[PDB]
Amino acid sequence: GAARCRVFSP
Amino acid sequence: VKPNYALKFTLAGHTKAVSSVKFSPNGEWLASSSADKLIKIWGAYDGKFEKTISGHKLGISDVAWSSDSNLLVSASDDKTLKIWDVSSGKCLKTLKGHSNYVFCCNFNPQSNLIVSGSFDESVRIWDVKTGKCLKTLPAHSDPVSAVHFNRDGSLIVSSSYDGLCRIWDTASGQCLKTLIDPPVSFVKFSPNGKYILAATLDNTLKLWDYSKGKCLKTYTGHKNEKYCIFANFSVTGGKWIVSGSEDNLVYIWNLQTKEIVQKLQGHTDVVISTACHPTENIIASAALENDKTIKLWKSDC
């Protein structure tokens, strides 16, 4: 995956 | 007056969620980046696939064009950025120094600098020619969702899950303004550089006078609680605000009245990214895992 394509949190 | 964007092309070929789409400044190309580790180049007017650019070892969260449309920069979960020569597809530089996912990136207008934001909570400024990190700004206390240069490259705006938007002097690296008033999932300067458009994960977009520290407009009606969805100023026809949504729609608002003027239906997952063509009334939109496609839309105004 890619971080933008996952839910945004620390 | 309202736009009448209509679907023109659906671009398939990414094998995981798309993360971002950007039109080249010269209007000829659309670039898309994906969780599938690839960049794809498409014709902006005919939708025709042009090429695949590869080399990142993990997925890509963002891609951006140089001002002359000759270079691309990509930000990856592999903790690097890559600078690519578009015509050849070769990786020209690998930008190393972030200690976690690189989330967002942009060239300055001069295109001698790249700005990047990362899960490592830092904003980095890089020299394009040498590929060396010029500055590491301890910008935020949580992941950085967006970084953007203003019209002359003298300022950078950053946003973060920590809830802040910060305006930075590019040359000195000093913070000149903090809009401290929810996680901020996107920010960018207005085309004239006087305003910033900030998305927060409470289903809200805001237009701010950052010098005044005053919120001038709020845009709502869409769903944005989970993802860092791109937003845009549309200036080729009517003056619109454009954004993806977590209800699988593209939303278009009148910038001044804040009314929703159109909702574009057809995507089957979160519309993570939208882009507005620099000269024609064309929108590109792109969506997550259940959809994996890019759609091009055109309007008469």
Residue numbers in the entry:
A (entry chain C): 40 to 49
B (entry chain A): 31 to 211, 215 to 334
What does the paper say about this structure?
pmcWDR5, a well-established core scaffolding protein found in histone methyltransferase complexes MLL1-4 and SET1A/B, was initially characterized as an epigenetic histone “writer” to recognize histone H3 lysine 4 (H3K4) and is essential for H3K4 di- and tri-methylation (H3K4me2 and H3K4me3) to activate gene transcription. Two separate and non-overlapping sites located on opposite surfaces of WDR5 mediate most of its interactions with binding partners: an arginine-bearing cavity located on the surface known as the WDR5-interacting (WIN) site, and a shallow cleft on the opposite side referred to as the WDR5-binding (WBM) site. The residues Val31-Cys334 of WDR5 are visible and consist of seven WD40 repeats that form a seven-bladed β-propeller structure.
There were two WDR5-MBD3C complexes per crystallographic asymmetric unit with a root-mean-square deviation (RMSD) of 0.140 Å between 277 pairs of Cα atoms. Nine residues (Gly40-Pro49) located at the N-terminus of the MBD3C peptide were successfully fitted into the electron density, while the last two residues (Qln50-Gly51) at the C-terminus could not be constructed due to weak electron density. Structural analysis revealed that MBD3C utilizes a unique binding mode to interact with WDR5, wherein MBD3C Arg43 and Phe47 are involved in recognizing the WDR5-interacting (WIN) site and Tyr191-related B site on the small surface of WDR5, respectively. Notably, the binding induces a ∼91° rotation of WDR5 Tyr191, generating the hydrophobic B site. MBD3C Arg43 directly inserts into the WIN site, located within the central channel of the WDR5 β-propeller. Furthermore, the guanidinium group is sandwiched between the aromatic side chains of Phe133 and Phe263 within this cavity, leading to the formation of cation-π interactions. Moreover, the aromatic ring of Phe47 stretched into the WDR5 hydrophobic B site, forming by Phe133, Phe149, Pro173, Ser175, Tyr191, Pro216, Ser218, Leu234, and Cys261. It is noteworthy that the sulfhydryl group of Cys261 also generates S-π interaction with the aromatic ring of Phe47 (48).
